[PDB]
């Protein structure tokens, strides 16, 4: 499957400035637009190199899209103040996901669309897309309001359809990044411990996409739970980076493997300390 | 309402002892988004430090990825300097060659 | 293309 996902913030300074508006668009991991309320002439700017071929009407409806989009948060905030009885003094955080998920198949897996207010669950479309979960008394308030404007049938419009073919067509203009693989490259390096014994660290560099599986095993054993290991982490130009290490006796480095499995290989790596 | 940032400091690429590189500083998983990274050398403030759009993940927790231009030595310490609403005082993680 | 959130709270 593959994901076109909007992630929204409206974040509230009072006494230094209007509250922030920010989006950023992503087609699966891959970040390919942003708005941001505090540019020097706020627009809706292309961060891929793919989604540069879209014409200037393209940037035009998406900047008033947002511009539109912020004016509707600012009330939100104001209204949250109200429902939660909080003062005009105290800077607020609203945050909203909008998107869907389609298998490989093109048709729809999930949609959301889903809101939270200083990082708490406040309402979500149900899976079912007809339907509001509220989390609290306040945004029961809301899901009312909602369900009497008809807002349910109208986002899942949108989902089901122009997220659903937007997706497929931006799958294929930035097919060659998207959808492509990088291997990952390996190797081991090796730290002696003041203990007495050493640490093995297995690296894996430069690997696209982010899914990865590194361990390392003694003896075709596992070893999952005396392993440490990283997150994930961007390189910052499209690759990743994780590690992975073991703590071993000094004198048996070479009774240890790691293994690498990633979509980029065309048999899984096993590596050693040489 | 309050969640301490994680810190990972690497490089773009494996170091190499005066050849220009790119050092990482991926902060994750704080909230409220309001936050100050600076990246150090020797104790003394990178002057260009470039960072990419902050985000958030499916738990409503912020993340970004600030990078600067830098150019490995033996002798010379880098670090990430992080601060954030939720520490009383600003968090340095140094740079390790081999993490 | 994003969504529009035509609904205030």
């Given at each position: 499957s593959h994901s076109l996902r909007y992630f929204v913030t409206a974040?509230?300074?009072?006494?230094?400035?209007?509250?922030?508006?920010?989006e950023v668009g992503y087609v699966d991991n891959t970040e390919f637009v942003?708005?941001?309320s505090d540019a020097e002439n706020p627009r809706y700017?292309?961060?891929?190199?793919?989604?540069?071929?879209?014409?200037?009407?393209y940037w035009e409806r998406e900047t008033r899209r947002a511009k539109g989009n912020e004016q509707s948060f600012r009330v939100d905030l104001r209204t949250a103040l109200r429902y939660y009885n909080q003062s005009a003094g105290g800077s607020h955080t609203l945050q909203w996901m909008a998107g869907c998920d389609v298998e490989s198949d093109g048709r729809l897996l999930r949609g959301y669309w889903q809101f939270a207010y200083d990082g708490c669950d406040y309402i979500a479309l149900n899976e079912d897309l007809k339907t509001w979960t509220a989390a609290?008394?306040?945004?029961q308030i809301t899901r009312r309001k909602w369900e009497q404007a008809g807002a349910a049938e109208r986002d899942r419009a949108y989902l089901e359809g122009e997220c659903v073919e937007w997706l497929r067509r931006y799958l294929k203009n930035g097919n060659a990044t998207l959808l492509r693989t990088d291997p990952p490259k390996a190797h081991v390096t090796h730290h002696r411990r003041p203990e007495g014994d050493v640490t093995l660290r297995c690296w894996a560099?430069?690997?696209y996409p982010a899914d990865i599986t590194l361990t390392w095993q003694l003896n075709g054993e596992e070893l999952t739970q005396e392993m440490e290991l990283v997150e994930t982490?961007?390189?910052?130009?499209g690759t990743f980076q994780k590690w992975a290490s073991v703590?071993?006796?000094?004198?048996?480095?070479?009774?240890?493997?790691?293994?690498?499995?990633?979509?980029?290989l065309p048999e899984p790596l096993t590596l050693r300390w040489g | 309402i309050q969640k301490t940032p994680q810190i990972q400091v690497y490089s773009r690429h494996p170091p190499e002892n005066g050849?220009?590189?790119?050092?990482?500083c991926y902060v994750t998983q704080f909230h409220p988004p309001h936050i100050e990274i600076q990246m150090l050398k020797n104790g003394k403030k990178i002057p260009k430090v470039e960072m990419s759009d902050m985000s958030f993940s499916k738990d409503w927790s912020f993340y970004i990825l600030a990078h600067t231009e830098f150019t490995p030595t033996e002798t010379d310490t880098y670090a990430c300097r992080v601060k954030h609403a939720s520490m009383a005082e600003p968090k340095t993680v140094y740079w390790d060659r081999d993490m | 293309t994003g969504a529009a959130s035509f609904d205030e709270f």
């Open positions: 974040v509230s300074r009072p006494g230094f400035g209007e509250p922030r508006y920010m942003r708005f941001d700017e292309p961060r891929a190199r793919w989604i540069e071929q879209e014409g200037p009407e609290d008394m306040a945004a560099l430069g690997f982490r961007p390189a910052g130009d703590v071993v006796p000094l004198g048996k480095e070479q009774k240890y493997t790691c293994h690498v499995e990633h979509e980029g | 050849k220009p590189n790119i050092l990482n | -």
